[PDB]
Design a protein around this ligand. Structure first.
Ligand SMILES: CCCCC[C@H](CC(=O)NO)C(=O)N1[C@@H]2CC[C@@H](C2)[C@H]1C(=O)Nc1nccnc1OC
Ligand SMILES: [Zn+2]
Ligand SMILES: [Zn+2]
Length: 200
């Protein structure tokens, strides 16, 4: 679910950043490792903000709302990192939003790949499962990526842990594909991020 809008793509893949106060050194290191992880596999670059108008701010506060997708422009944009969402893979997911990725399960073509079990979604959280309107996303020829760092888990926003909200529609190499990994950027995430930033 890569943004269709070329203005939300960060110029030359250069994202200026600021790590805010109230983080431990250990937490600061995790942010750095996450940014490096994006730098390693793609042509995107994270640089300490000096006098730029556009930059990301790692901000110590409760998890959740909200992570701007792509370059907002004309000011800073925050990444909320709290006690329960400070791990490497979650930060990599958040930086996935920064570069310009929506959630994978909201791709305009997602109904061919996953079923959404509406009855199991927490009341009031159903909007998190709405498809992106087709004018907001361009997949760049890349297939639906079940392994994406941007893909929800099977029971994200579920009424209970043993109730699925998202069920993959078909088998992939013998079995229903696992979804919701927060370990590392997928082959698909990299391949698609390389396309979005025209990397060599
Ligand atoms: C339950 C509370 C709302 C959840 C908000 C998600 C959190 C997320 O996915 N973190 O990784 C978010 O921030 N989102 C959704 C996923 C990409 C988009 C939609 C992002 C968002 O809301 N972005 C913004 N949209 C409009 C204005 N400002 C935004 O971010 C600052
Ligand atoms: Zn997200
Ligand atoms: Zn993808």
């Amino acid at each position: 679910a890569a943004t269709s809008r070329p203005e939300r793509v960060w110029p030359d893949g250069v994202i200026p950043f600021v790590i805010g106060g109230n983080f431990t050194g250990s937490q600061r290191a995790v942010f750095r490792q996450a940014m490096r992880h994006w730098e390693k596999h793609t042509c995107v670059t994270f640089l300490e903000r000096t006098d730029e108008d556009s930059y990301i701010v790692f901000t110590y506060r409760p998890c959740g709302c909200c992570s701007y997708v792509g370059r907002r422009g004309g000011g800073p944009q925050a990444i909320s990192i709290g006690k329960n969402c400070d791990k490497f893979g979650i930060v990599v997911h958040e930086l996935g939003h920064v570069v310009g990725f929506w959630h994978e399960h909201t791709r305009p073509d997602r109904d061919r790949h996953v079923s959404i079990v509406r009855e199991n979604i927490q009341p009031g959280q159903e909007y998190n499962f709405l498809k992106m309107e087709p004018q907001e996303v361009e997949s760049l020829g890349e297939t639906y990526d079940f392994d994406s760092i941007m893909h929800y888990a099977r029971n994200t926003f579920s009424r209970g842990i043993f109730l699925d909200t998202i069920v993959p529609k078909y088998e992939v190499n013998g079995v229903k594909p696992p979804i919701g990994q927060r370990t590392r950027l997928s082959k698909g995430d990299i391949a698609q991020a390389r396309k979005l930033y025209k990397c060599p």
